[PDB]
Design a protein around this ligand. Structure first.
Ligand SMILES: CCCCCCCCCCNCCSSCc1ccc(Cl)cc1
Ligand SMILES: *SCCNCCCCCCCCCC
Length: 962
């Protein structure tokens, strides 16, 4: 029931739609009849050069529909007030405050979620209004608390075990399962929680259940709270702020007025905003602020220098601001459509004003439109800075979720467009088939190809000026000379951006950027949480670190055919849940809704035949009348995934077949499976039937029986279709669609009839979801002889394998690029850089200054313990000693390359005379008896020094540039 309308298809609106489609709402409808201008290609990556003139919504819908095949996207050319009732949430962008009041006054009374967002230069605002009765089922990002119990006392004190999870509140509810000693406590009815200590909590007197209870598990049941939102009209007078930065606490009240005057200016100028850095327009703009500050009886004192800056940047359109605001706003849409997180309440006024360049001229003349696709960025940073961007040489590590967002941001900014510019992208991974509907740049035609290579191509279409400027690799940023990114590669670079969660890559990328003194931008995400890190040479610390810890991933052939751990069966069970009770239901509902679904699915779907077979199987062939046919369907699924597929697997590879070597095929990570025969009196087998049949009946809206006498009756006369393993099946280690379409009932014959999709939810123990995943996982584990896991461990493992969220991924990419322009400006003051952290689930945002690098003094001069070093050519050993004595006032006492002692000042001339005239590279090759590798272009030396008085002075390492 989560229909989303999005008003406005500029840079901001197209980012929100991208994330909302990739997040997977019911449907998205766009509204933007305005013709495409040239200045919209500053942040609108779905508009090309020869799309100028056409309405922005019509050109962008075909690119949105290609994102997620289970999210129908449509366009409206007209907008009615009553038409808004077709949507659970309404997002408004690029709209005057006049129309916002007209829209919000309706949505607030009809209980329609309202979000208004605007990207205006380096300034932005987000307003949320979810009605005055909005119910939220989860007020924090935390999953419901679970853990094992030590004991429960008769007074009601529950002492928690080694787990001691985090963290309980008062008024929460917990339910108990398998707590021995108190039988009636495991019924399922929750109990109130009063926390006594960090390991205990009280549930009330349980003396009516037993003297002492032991063991068991507790699961928190979160009580839904209600949140009263004020309308835009009444919050315009009394605004409630959410602060993105407590250091800019005095700025939201200024921003609240400036954005209102920003619309009062558009009313007086045919909807146009003030001109870039225009003093005449900003003078008129300040006056508007002065009027609105008086009528709203605001006690604030107008920061004229700050407010006028909003006018100077009014018509700026930065892709970084669209990524940051767009990801956050899309997360608010999901809060409105799932009721699962705490919304922004209600005003989120934001700036990244420190990103404003200072090494170039910012004026009317510099920020004047040029007629190109970068006008929206030039309107803020100026024309001279645009060439600084265009000549950048960047190195992006990783082409997954964050890397693709990063490349998108670089293509809209003109990075590496100019003469000396170049982009280098690397990622060893390839594109697979499972996650295609969650990928931004990847489509079904790219399966098997390299992520980095396809990402470069998709970005070169967003900005054709990047063709030939991007070089794609399939390499890890790894060991030293083996590289294969050597000294020549890193010295050309302007900066490095790390978009991988890999711990290996982070270590090397950090270490390499320190040695070559190149700026580093780092980013990572973990669910709703994310953080950004900027490393500036000769300024900040090289690590910052304390990002969120990473997560794992599994090979395709391991999950599908050769599992050997219980975590493999759980992922396989979670994906199965999606294929039986989710994706086919979505295909059916779209076929009954979108009239052009037949041709839309051919271009978008990864498996257009399975889409059509889903519609046929679920609408006619296997549509159940009663729950008794749901049990027969569930019984058929048992053979289909725990018997027929295993017979097929043993058919292609028998239990005792051999490889090319002659060794058994089933050995090591490959465990020999065994098909299951259905035992109705086996707990795992029966728990699957109940869970699958009840979930199948859920899709069709049928009453799920739980009487084992009904199951026993149906399963006795179950006649399966005779299965025999097929030959010529590959197991990994057009008009035919009209034929299936002729087997589909006409959409007109099924008006109003819909199927209810199953949205996976671990926190409700009554929806049979975890029951299904536990049973399907344990049954597959029984196939391959793997130790099964109870529903507690299964629920735990399933919670830690959720994919990266596109909302978090967008927000970091925007934060990284808002710190990118600071690096290009060459900012040298550490207070102007920001390390970000956020948690979209609670509307928390944090911007902290980077820590300075630690310093020390050598002969009264300050040096950088991290970034300073002695750069010497491949001179002789004697010449190196002379340099430190004559030019540094230091007597070198120990010289080494790694652990190899190259020189010590006490060595007799029997050792030194043969080595002092040697070049360092010749001295190194002689000591440890090894030839220098061909692309070993530098030599790192450690050195111990004494001053003039014989005391040891700590000095940096040496870099021999050979
Ligand atoms: C109840 C039905 C309501 C019907 C409303 C129909 C609106 C269609 C357009 C007609 N003129 C309204 C202009 S508002 S857009 C503000 C804006 C646009 C462009 C730029 Cl650059 C800046 C700002
Ligand atoms: S004063 C020069 C510093 N060398 C002595 C400190 C002990 C070094 C041990 C670790 C260095 C190995 C290089 C990887």
């Amino acid at each position: 029931q989560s229909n989303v309308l999005i008003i406005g298809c500029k840079g901001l609106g197209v980012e929100i739609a991208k994330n909302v489609c990739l997040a997977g709402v019911k449907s998205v409808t766009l509204y933007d009849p305005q013709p495409t201008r040239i200045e919209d290609l500053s942040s609108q990556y779905f508009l090309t050069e020869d799309d100028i003139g056409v309405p922005r919504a019509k050109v962008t819908v075909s690119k949105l529909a290609e994102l997620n095949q289970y999210v129908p996207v449509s366009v409206v050319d007209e907008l009615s007030t009553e038409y808004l009732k077709n949507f659970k949430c309404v997002v408004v962008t690029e709209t005057s405050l006049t129309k916002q009041l007209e829209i919000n006054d309706f949505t607030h009374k009809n209980h329609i979620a309202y979000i208004a967002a605007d990207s205006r230069g380096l300034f932005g605002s987000i307003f949320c209004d979810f009605g005055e009765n909005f119910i939220c089922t989860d007020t924090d990002g935390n999953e419901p608390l679970t853990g094992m119990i030590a004991s429960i006392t008769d007074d009601g004190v529950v002492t928690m075990l080694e787990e001691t999870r985090h963290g309980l509140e008062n008024g929460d509810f917990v339910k108990f399962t398998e707590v021995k000693g108190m039988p009636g406590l495991n019924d399922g009815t929750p109990r109130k929680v009063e926390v006594k200590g960090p390991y205990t909590f009280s549930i009330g007197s349980v003396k009516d259940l037993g003297s002492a209870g032991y063991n068991g598990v507790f699961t928190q049941v979160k009580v839904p709270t209600k949140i009263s939102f004020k309308s835009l009209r009444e919050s315009l007078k009394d605004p409630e702020y959410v602060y993105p930065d407590f250091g800019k606490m005095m700025r939201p009240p200024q921003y609240h007025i400036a954005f209102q005057a920003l619309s009062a200016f558009a009313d007086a100028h045919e909807g146009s905003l003030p001109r870039p850095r225009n003093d005449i327009d900003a003078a008129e703009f300040f006056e508007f602020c002065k009027k609105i500050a008086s009528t709203l009886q605001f006690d604030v004192e107008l920061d004229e220098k700050l407010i006028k800056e909003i006018s100077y940047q009014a018509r700026g359109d930065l892709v970084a601001m669209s990524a940051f605001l767009g990801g956050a706003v899309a997360q608010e849409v999901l809060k409105a459509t799932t009721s699962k997180f705490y919304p922004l309440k209600q005003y989120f006024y934001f700036d990244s004003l420190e990103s404003l360049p200072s090494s170039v001229t910012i004026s009317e003349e510099t920020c004047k439109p040029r007629g190109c696709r970068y006008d929206g960025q030039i309107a803020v940073f100026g024309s001279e800075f645009q060439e600084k961007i265009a000549s950048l040489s960047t190195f992006l590590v990783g082409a997954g979720a964050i890397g693709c967002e990063m490349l998108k941001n670089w293509a809209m900014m003109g990075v590496a467009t100019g003469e000396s510019g170049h982009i280098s992208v690397t990622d060893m991974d390839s594109i697979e088939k499972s996650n295609l509907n969650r990928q931004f740049l990847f489509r079904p035609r790219d399966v098997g190809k390299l992520k980095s290579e396809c990402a470069s191509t998709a970005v070169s279409i967003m900005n054709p000026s990047l063709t030939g400027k991007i070089t794609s690799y399939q390499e890890r940023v790894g060991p030293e000379s083996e590289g294969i990114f050597g000294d020549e590669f890193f010295e050309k670079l302007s900066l490095v951006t790390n978009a991988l969660d890999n711990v290996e890559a982070r270590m090397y990328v950090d270490r390499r950027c320190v040695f070559f003194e190149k700026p580093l931008l780092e980013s990572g995400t973990l669910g709703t949480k994310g953080n950004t890190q900027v490393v500036v040479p000769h300024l900040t610390e090289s690590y910052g670190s304390s990002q969120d810890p990473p997560e794992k991933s599994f090979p395709i052939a391991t999950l599908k055919n050769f599992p050997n751990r219980i975590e493999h069966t759980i992922a396989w069970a979670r994906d199965l849940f999606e294929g039986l009770f989710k994706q086919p239901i979505d295909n059916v509902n779209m076929y009954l809704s979108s009239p052009n679904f037949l041709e839309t699915s051919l271009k978008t779907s990864s498996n257009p035949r399975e889409v059509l077979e889903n519609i046929r199987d679920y609408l006619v062939t296997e549509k159940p009348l009663s729950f008794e046919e749901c049990i027969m369907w569930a019984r058929l699924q048992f053979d289909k995934f725990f018997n027929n597929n295993i017979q097929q697997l043993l058919f292609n590879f028998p239990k005792d077949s051999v490889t090319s070597t002659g060794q058994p095929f089933w050995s090591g990570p490959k465990r020999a499976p065994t098909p299951l025969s259905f035992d109705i009196h086996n707990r795992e087998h029966f728990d699957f039937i109940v869970a699958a049949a009840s979930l199948y009946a859920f899709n069709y809206g049928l009453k799920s029986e739980t009487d084992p006498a009904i199951y026993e009756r149906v399963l006795a006369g179950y006649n399966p279709p005779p299965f025999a393993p097929k030959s010529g099946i590959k197991i990994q280690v057009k008009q035919e669609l009209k034929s299936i379409a002729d087997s589909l009932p006409p959409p007109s014959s099924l008006v109003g009839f819909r199927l209810t999709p199953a949205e996976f939810e671990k926190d409700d123990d009554s929806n049979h979801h975890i029951d299904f995943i536990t049973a399907a996982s344990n049954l597959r584990a029984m196939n391959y002889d793997i130790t099964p896991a109870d529903r507690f461990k299964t629920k735990f493992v399933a919670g830690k394998i959720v994919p990266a969220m596109c909302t978090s991924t967008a927000v970091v990419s925007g934060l990284v690029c808002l710190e990118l322009v600071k690096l290009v400006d060459g900012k040298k003051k550490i207070e102007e850089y920001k390390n970000g952290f956020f948690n979209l689930a609670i509307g928390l945002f944090t911007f902290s200054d980077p820590i300075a690098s630690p310093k020390m003094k050598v002969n009264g001069k300050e040096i950088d313990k991290i970034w300073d070093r002695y750069n010497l050519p491949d001179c002789t050993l004697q010449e190196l000693i002379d340099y430190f004595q004559k030019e540094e006032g230091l007597e070198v006492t120990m010289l080494s390359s790694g652990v190899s002692l190259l020189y010590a000042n006490f060595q007799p001339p029997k050792k030194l005379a043969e080595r002092l005239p040697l070049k360092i590279s010749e001295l190194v090759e002689q000591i440890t008896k090894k030839k220098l590798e061909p692309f070993r272009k530098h030599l790192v030396l450690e050195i111990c020094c004494d001053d003039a008085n014989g005391e040891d002075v700590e000095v940096p390492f040496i870099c021999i540039k050979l």
